[model samples]
Target: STGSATTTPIDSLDDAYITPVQIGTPAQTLNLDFDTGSSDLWVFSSETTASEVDGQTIYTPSKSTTAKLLSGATWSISYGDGSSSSGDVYTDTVSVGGLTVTGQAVESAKKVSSSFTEDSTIDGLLGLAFSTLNTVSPTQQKTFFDNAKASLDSPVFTADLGYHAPGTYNFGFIDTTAYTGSITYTAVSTKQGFWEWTSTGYAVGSGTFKSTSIDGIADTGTTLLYLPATVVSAYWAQVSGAKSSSSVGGYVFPCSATLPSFTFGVGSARIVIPGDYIDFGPISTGSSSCFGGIQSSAGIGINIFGDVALKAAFVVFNGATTPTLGFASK
Candidate 1:
């Protein structure tokens, strides 16, 4: 069976997308971050410390008849952004959109960092990456997507994120009408527990396309497009007053600068990211300097094609025996 869920941005910066999920027997609805970058379907729960609640929805396992404790199971995860959460495990009826996974392992957070508590919009994260990345100890748990793959009409899920607007996440089958142009398929390396792929090359605005291979992960969890310093520097060089700042933490420039569009090659297909999406947001609320959506991934160790790039195209995470990633312009 096929299922689809509406994912909306939690903030104006398009920092993260939140998709409503129903957990337990009576169905407790909570908005969760559908993160393809990680693999732990963890949630804020009654076990969470009261000080860390901060208005976010929590899953009460005791309230669910179907809930079963995964004896001695525990999980802890830390994101690239440094936010973290850890908790015990419970298997319950977890549903996203209309897709239901009975006995789905739901990690209930006993502790969460300030970043998660402060951002009350997102209750938790539903990891879509390979189950190998799951942080559950002793016996690793399968992700919702992994468990539901066998029953899905197709072993694939698509991510269509919008800029400051609601997007859609479709599972089981691809909606042909959701994208324009032909879909370009590429081999994905799950060895690293990510939807990692190699891009053919990139072009700054309408400039010439450089035929260089760049390895990166298609991460829905990350907010910015992180590329190598060479590529990131090349893009920023075109903008006036743009500089890689120490105090600001990344490339920042005048908010009024005429930013250039970024184009990345997926096989022979070129997906163009509009300039407006690259202008992430101002450093401060009313600050004159704005942070560039595209930043250097030197410190990150690996390049990441985050929401800034994913939002510009249609992405399909195909979980066939030989996993592959598909990209299409929309």
Candidate 2:
């Protein structure tokens, strides 16, 4: 009854949303986003002030027969973006698909920022990432995955994003057949919660990138790929007629010509980024054009490979057995 009792709320924005296994009995529809940077499930509550809960969908647990508030447990969290939320703890019989999880910890924020309130499209976030970054610990620690890993069929979870629309996000059991072959497993360093590694160099089209050693982190929570300033500048130099324009944050290039193909080397595994991903959106300035993807960010501490990089391969987080990560393909 372990895996049968694990569940969380999921957003219906697209079919690619991750669904909780078991917990609530579907009293009210809750939209949840799977986050790897943090742990805990937080949702807007009806008791929240109008200003604090502006654009967010507030869930009323009192309307659900399975909802139960935990006594004396309070929770709060602050993101790197400076957004914070505080609320009380609650227990609920949550359900996802055909799986049911009981007494799952839920957070109901009493005070939230306007930006969060305005995002009405999503109701809450289900953090299946890790327990080290958990805000609700000691009194109420351990996330859904922490408690349900032993009960899972494969002790692994797979995330599949939509290329266009109706993206399918799944948890629990890594379908080996859905992968290309054996996964490339890496040992996780204990320094930060991110997956860090040293890059050999980069490759563009048929040509290899400037051979240089660079350290980087793989983060799923971030949406864009961030690289070192020196490396970024070197890459832009390869593009023809590439000029520094402040209009598009200084990284935009002319759209008339095809963008250069770039590939990052991890040991011997080379990960390539197509021109489209680099030039996400073309910005026109007079007779010149600017593209998205590669941009400048202060404090280029570590190279960050976000959703754009992860979606290209079948990623398997194998922290259940050891503090290691596995990457495969479907």
Candidate 3:
């Protein structure tokens, strides 16, 4: 049977998308960031310090009869942006969009970084990636999608992360109405516990589609697209006023700068990202400066196709053999 859930933007910031989740038998509802980048379902809990609670909700395991502590089980995680959280683990029933998984491992945060505690926008994160990347110590943990796959009609999920708008995450079955045109399928390797794929090639707007292969991961938790510095420089070269800025510490161009289109290849099919989408957001209050959507992938090895790149296309995270990625123009 197919199960689906609606994903809403967390305010106009567009920094992340959130979904409602139910944990424990009595159902303590929390808004969680449905991140496909990392594997761990962590939430603010009774174990959290009073100062860390802030305005976000917390889960009290002792209040739920079904909540059972996983002794000696602990989890620690750090994000690409340097945000960190760690805590004890509990085995309980966790449900998303009415789909429930019993005995799921839920990480309850006892320690959180200032970055995480300050905003208090999301209570936790529900990792949709593979279980191999789970941060549980002493023993590995399975993600909600992986644990629920056995009962799903099909071992697949779709990400309809629309641009600055609401999206949908569907599991077990693909929805024909979510996207347009044929889905260009490409194989992936989850050895790194990511939806990693190799692009046949890419072009900078009307430029040649270089044959150079680009290894990248489709990440929902990330806010921007990260590509090789060399490639990013090439894209900026197309913009008349674009240049590297030490003040902003990122590539910036005139807000009115006409950006060239970016196209990425998936097998034989080519997916194009319009120029307008490349202006991620205004860099200055005057709106005269804009940040380039694609930035250098310096510290990060493989390129990252965060929401910026994924927003240009409809994506299917097929857990079938090899964990392939299907891309289609929206």
Candidate 4:
């Protein structure tokens, strides 16, 4: 049987929707961000500083009869966005949707950066990346999906991320009723523990779609789309007043500009991200200024297909030996 879970939006644009999971014995539920970019199912716990935890829930080990400490085990993680969290390890039964992955490594948080402590309302992260990415010191851990896959009917999952609405993260099976159009599958490169793939090229507005071979990871935890500088600059050039602001750290334009439609080629299929979707909301300059969703990841020289791009389509994070991604218009 396949297992699936519904994700609920905590704030706007479903910026980072979180899903519920039960931890320990008798089941204590906590909301977690199902992050694909990193591995390690870490959560806020009794070890977390009381003052630092705000608008968040913590998992208490004492309440769970089956939870046990993985003596001397420890882990720490840092994200591309500068958010971070760290904790000690505990073996516990973790359940999401209708399936329970027993003896999963549950990193109980000892400390979290303000970026994670202040901005969002999530108890932890349920990493779906390869087990090789797990950060535990002595022995690395397998993620929820990795542990649950053996029992799954199909070793696949779909990420139906929505814009300002609740989406889903399905495990072990794909629900045909959730999507339309044929699923265009692309081979995934998981060398970096990410669902990495290449887009043939992209077009700015109604312009010609260039075949640039942009390589990047499809990250659900991240909020916006990050592209190569060349592509980013091309899109910004179309905006009359767009400027690369050091203070804003990305290009910004007067909110009145009619953003153009940005399209990327997946094999031969073109996924179009509407111009309006590229407007990432306003910069607080008190002058009607706004930030552009498309930004330069030239420093890293890799693209990131974050929420801005994922929300434009229904994506499947197919977890096979040779992982593949299936995209279709939502």
Candidate 5:
């Protein structure tokens, strides 16, 4: 069977992509972040601390007849952004789009970090990364994608993130009409439990393509494109008045700056990110200074091709025995 879900930006800044998910017996619907960078499906629940409930939807496991507690099980996870959540585990019926999985581990949050509490747009996260990265203790749990792969006509999924528009996430089959040019396939290494691949090189604006190997992970969970300092600096240098501000902790420039487009290669296929996409957003309301979608990955160690890059092209996360990543223009 094949299934597809519509994903929309949480806000105008395209901070994150969210899709509706149904959980439990009678079906409780909640909007969740479809994060490919993480591997634990967790949600704010009736068990969450009152102080942390700030207007977000909460899952009530007690209301679901099929909900069962995973004895002695617990989970805790922290992201590079420093946000985190920890909770007890429960097994319940979970469905995304039309794909359903029984006994899916649904982590019910007992505690959540301030960032999550502050952003009420997302009820929780639906992890699409490899199950090996799951945080459940004693016995790690499989992700929604991992558990449903066998039932799918094809053990694969595709991410079609859009720029300021609603996108689609399809499982089991690829929508050929969604993309233009032929897809370029590259080998993927799930050793790190991520969709890790190597970029052939990059080009700033119309500059010549540099022959370099850039190792990075395709992460829908993250909002920006983080690359090596050398590459990032080179790209920023092309823009006048662009500077790395210590105060904001990233590169910022005049909101009116004429930004240059960024291009990165997958095999021989080069995907171009329009200049407007890099003009991320204003630092403060009505502020003249704006943040750049492309930033340096020095602090994170691993370069991340996040939504900023993913939204520019069609991406496939093939789950065959020897997994591969396919990139195409649209």
Candidate 6:
């Protein structure tokens, strides 16, 4: 459970929205998406040519009399999902909660396709996943965290996403009191630019598989936990004669029997995914069903510990110290 708050149903791409702390002396408001899959902060610009941009929220610099822009250097970004955009770089004062950061770097896409320009509700996206995946190079600029860390009282930063709440991406010094216990710290792999871990194997019901170990990477950006296909199939097979069902454009299982417990090893840490993550929906046809936290992406070469997994644990990321990640529980 996500502490005492109710868990909101995150639907497809629509559920990805977040409210980023805006910058300014008074602090303006802006909606953003927290993404772990990539690292970059982008928004729509008022100066953008309307015909060239599509499917994204455009930020009007003129609207905020307080906003400022960096030199008009061109910037562009491409995602693994085949979406891309280009724009000019800008700088402005922004804030999250009571924490304020000045001269934040932002990319305002001038030339965007319908996929990016059409959406008017989504203001921008905040990249909180990893520094290695950051689209902004050190030569080009510093990241949102790099800029904000100095102003923050604590060395670590934490984001507590609210369920269905319009604006809930919290920033600044971490409130350790919000959590029930101490957070677990995981060593990051400097080579990969991601928080990596070694899995001991996985378990379904009482059956355990040792040959297939896994790694955990806490990512708020990714919506689902990806697992190997073979492991998913084997686990589903244990669901009391359960068969594969389709949901969220993926395979899930339909079984009335109590689903077995699933656990994944991350070095010495044994993290267990709750059964509700598997129980899905009750729809008769095209019904939503609980999905296997693990999925198959043969060539992707990595197992992601997406929001589904991280939501169960209070997680924190500290970049002020470089090459290390700090964790905590709530």
TM-scores for the candidates? 0.99, 0.79, 0.95, 0.96, 0.99, 0.77
Task: Count steric clashes of candidate 6.
Answer: 28
lDDT of 5 by residue, 1-330 (tens): 888999999999899999999999899988999999999999999999999999999899999999999999999999989999999999999988998999999999999999999998899999999999999999999999999999999999999999999999999999999999899999899999999999999999999999799999999999999999999999999999999999999999889899999999999889999998888779999999999999999999899999999999999999998999999999
Ranking by lDDT: 1, 5, 3, 4, 2, 6
lDDT by residue (1-330, candidate 2, tens digit) is: 212212222232121243433334456656666666567778877767666665555677787677887888888888644677778877886655444556778787788776567666556677766666667634855666666566566566565543333333444666566557567766666366555656678766667567787666555555556777776777788788776666546676666767766777655565666665566444643445756465544545557766555555666666555666566554
Q: Compared with the true structure, what per-residue lDDT tens digits does model 6 show for residues 1-330?
A: 011111222343223555544644345566666665566777766767778555544566666656666654666777644567767766777655555556777777676656556555566666665555666533365566666666556555564543334223434555667566565555666456565655567777667645565665656766656677777777767775565444454555553556766776544555566665555444344544444444554446777777655654555666556545444434
The count of residue-pair clashes in candidate 3 stands at 0
Ranking of all candidate structures by their TM-score, best first:
1, 5, 4, 3, 2, 6
Q: What C-alpha lDDT values do all the predictions have?
A: 0.95, 0.61, 0.87, 0.86, 0.95, 0.58
User: Comparing candidate 3 with candidate 4, which one achieves the higher TM-score?
Assistant: 4
Candidate 6 error regions (>4 Å): 1-14, 23-27, 48-57, 113-121, 130-132, 136-139, 159-172, 199-201, 205-213, 240-249, 255-261, 279-293, 320-322, 326-330
- Best-matching candidate per lDDT: 1
Question: How far out, in Å, is residue 109 in model 6?
Answer: 1.9
Error of model 6, residue 287, in angstroms: 3.6
Which is the better candidate, 1 or 4, if ranked by lDDT? 1
**lDDT tens digits, residue span 103-164, model 4:** 99999999999977885478899988778899998899899888988898888888887667
Checking candidate 1 for backbone clashes, the offending pairs are: none
Regions of model 1 farther than 4 Å from truth? none
Report the lDDT of model 3 for residue 217.
93
Looking at candidate 6, the ten consecutive residues that score lowest on lDDT are: 1-10
lDDT of 6 at 131: 55
